[PDB]
Design a protein around this ligand. Sequence first.
Ligand SMILES: COc1ncc(C2CC2)nc1C(=O)NCCc1nc(-c2cccnc2)n[nH]1
Ligand SMILES: [Mg+2]
Ligand SMILES: [Zn+2]
Length: 313
Amino acid sequence: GLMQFTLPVRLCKEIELFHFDIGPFENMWPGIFVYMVHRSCGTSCFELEKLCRFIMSVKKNYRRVPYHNWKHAVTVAHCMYAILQNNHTLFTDLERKGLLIACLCHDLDHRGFSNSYLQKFDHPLAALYSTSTMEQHHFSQTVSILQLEGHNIFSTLSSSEYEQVLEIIRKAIIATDLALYFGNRKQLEEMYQTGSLNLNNQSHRDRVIGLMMTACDLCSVTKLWPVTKLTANDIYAEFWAEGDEMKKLGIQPIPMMDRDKKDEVPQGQLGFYNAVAIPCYTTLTQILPPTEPLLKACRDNLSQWEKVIRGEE
Ligand SMILES: COc1ncc(C2CC2)nc1C(=O)NCCc1nc(-c2cccnc2)n[nH]1
Ligand SMILES: [Mg+2]
Ligand SMILES: [Zn+2]
């Protein structure tokens, strides 16, 4: 039990900040994750050997796509680590255990294609899961990996604690379906403003964990401008491949996914910040005041995209 992970000094300090970038050294990401689990949860949350075997099976089941990759998984888990560390007392032992795992697993076996593309392609996963198609798949892969011999990182939980943590993970992963985010945030906005938001109401906690999941999932828009700008290229590399595949099915893709419309990206980033990101981190900041740095970084990046449009870069 006496075996800590320790990071170099710059990482030890910067990993506590919301805008931390996990860096280009893939072989350090498992250790960064274990470090975050040890501080977020405890050195006793998980058997190290099991957790290490789980992490590497999760990594193996992320594909080599430009954005929805192993780096995205660890990045989204680090944003969750930062939310949990800045909100020490608000979350149960089971939630701390479940949420970092849910974030690491939330896009397992992603192919770089939206729920929409699977539905138009008539992918078998769209027959199995009519809504939140990829997200039900990601949860399904998470359960598959938990069931591999030596991979049950939760084995020391009671039967009912195990059912609760898999239920946290399932709702947490379903919530990363952005189609569900709009209504979830509107409801949380109404509840916060009429004063009815109650964190002892399980269905309220669920909604708040959902918004955290969106916040962590979108956290590329909360980095320093050079990270945000370079990640946008990975995001659009997937979208334009999906666009190309839509054109192959005989469907004009939306402009966001059409590589012939790269010029419209700065404006498309504005829409996205104004319709999705800013509202997300605003309602999050209202519910969890110490997550304000995410909102502040998001606003900084909106301003940088405004400057791109004004040809000031
Ligand atoms: C331009 O899109 C994105 N840019 C950056 C990132 C960063 C966080 C990774 N993610 C998306 C993204 O996930 N788009 C797909 C889903 C989606 N887009 C919209 C939308 C767009 C424009 C205006 N209103 C709404 N609703 N749903
Ligand atoms: Mg996803
Ligand atoms: Zn994701």
